[PDB]
RNA sequence: AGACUAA
Ligand SMILES: Nc1ncnc2c1ncn2[C@@H]1O[C@H](COP(=O)(O)OP(=O)(O)O)[C@@H](O)[C@H]1O
């Protein structure tokens with residue numbers, strides 16, 4: 241039994257059995273991260289189990305550290321700055337960090353227990369990690385716990401909450417506004433506003449600030465300084481990207497959710513390429529997670545979820561299913577085995593098994609292009625599998641005529657590290673490296689040989 | 692677009 245939001249004294253022993261994968265499918269705010277997780281960790285320490293804890297984002301990592309403070313845990317995330325003895329048997333890191341470690345040099349510990357929080361995260365690295373984890377379990381080398389309110393196949397955007405939620409459909413602005421949206425600033429509580437991009441977030445926050453609103457912006461770029469401010473200071477709005485979609489305890493009263501964002505899609509008509517499609521409706525799982533930021537406090541009964549449009553369950557044309565396979569085909573168990581995707585996530589795309597496996601040197605290039613090059617999984621794979629070395633940038637210029645990149649409707653030209661002026665015309669097109677002006681600037685640095 | 696930045 242438990243009280244006062246404190247971890248339970250009692251933990252089922254069966255969750256620690258090798259060959260067992262436990263899905264903890266409990267509604268938002270039930271206590272997965274800050275109550276159940278510490279119980280598991282405490283018991284895993286008593287059992288002397290080599291343990292891995294996985295957060296999707298630094299937001300969830302920060303929530304975990306609050307719940308786990310004082311326990312001998314080695315934090316491998318910049319979100320947390322803690323003293324480590326180097327003798328810890330519990331590691332904590334983000335999903336993508338684990339997959340990166342799996343892909344690289346560099347022996348990963350043989351964990352006996354793996355706890356993944358937000359085990360539905362559709363990031364290609366997270367899907368890949370779930371493949372590796374479920375394979376370790378199946379092989380008898382690990383027990384694993386997958387925690388999420390929205391496990392694969394979830395279709396309900398309005399799940400259970402600790403307190404009643406008032407679900408409201410209204411038009412929501414995507415850009416600044418003058419009139420017509422008084423309900424936004426008339427509201428007297430705290431609002432978490434999900435925006436599809438940092439650029440849109442800047443515009444909306446700037447607009448809210450001219451109404452005399454205290455606004456905190458949250459994203460990968462601002463997390464380090466801004467997240468503690470959501471915890472320690474008084475604010476009216478949090479304008480946030482998907483960084484905050486999961487796990488956050490904002491102690492807020494309202495979520496504004498336009499339920500729409502851009503997604504990478506692989507096109508297979510004509511030469512294969514990646515576009516940024518949409519903005520398109522989010523999945524029911526994403527909508528339920530965003531909504532799940534409120535109705536979290538039983539003593540607070542008038543919380544609101546303001547949304548626009550229906551969700552779209554079908555995400556099968558999304559690049560993340562293929563990119564997860566590209567990653568997982570290149571991960572090995574120490575026994576030598578090919579990891580398979582987590583059951584519920586198999587046959588999301590009709591790609592043949594092991595078809596993305598790279599040979600030795602090409603595998604090393606593949607990792608470099610992602611980590612050093614800041615290139616998407618798909619693009620890194622295309623370049624690596626063509627036998628191109630990390631430093632050879634000729635492919636950025638030898639694409640067909642139609643692959644010419646434009647900026648402000650002019651042909652982008654590169655001045656190379658050796659002095660030549662060349663037109664940016666890559667052999668493979670991935671809109672993620674040219675759509676956003678900042679991304680294009682970076683890809684221009686890459687094409688120059690300055691990355 | 693968004694997230695991740697570890698041996
Ligand atoms: N800093 C905090 N102060 C007060 N209550 C909190 C705090 N953080 C979390 N809670 C509450 O504890 C409950 C369980 O939280 P959590 O473990 O984050 O839920 P889950 O992981 O299932 O979404 C929620 O009702 C939440 O609002």
Ligand SMILES: [Cl-]
Nearest residue numbers: 489490491536
């Ligand atoms: Cl909360």
Ligand SMILES: [Mn+2]
Nearest residue numbers: 272273274487
């Ligand atoms: Mn949680």
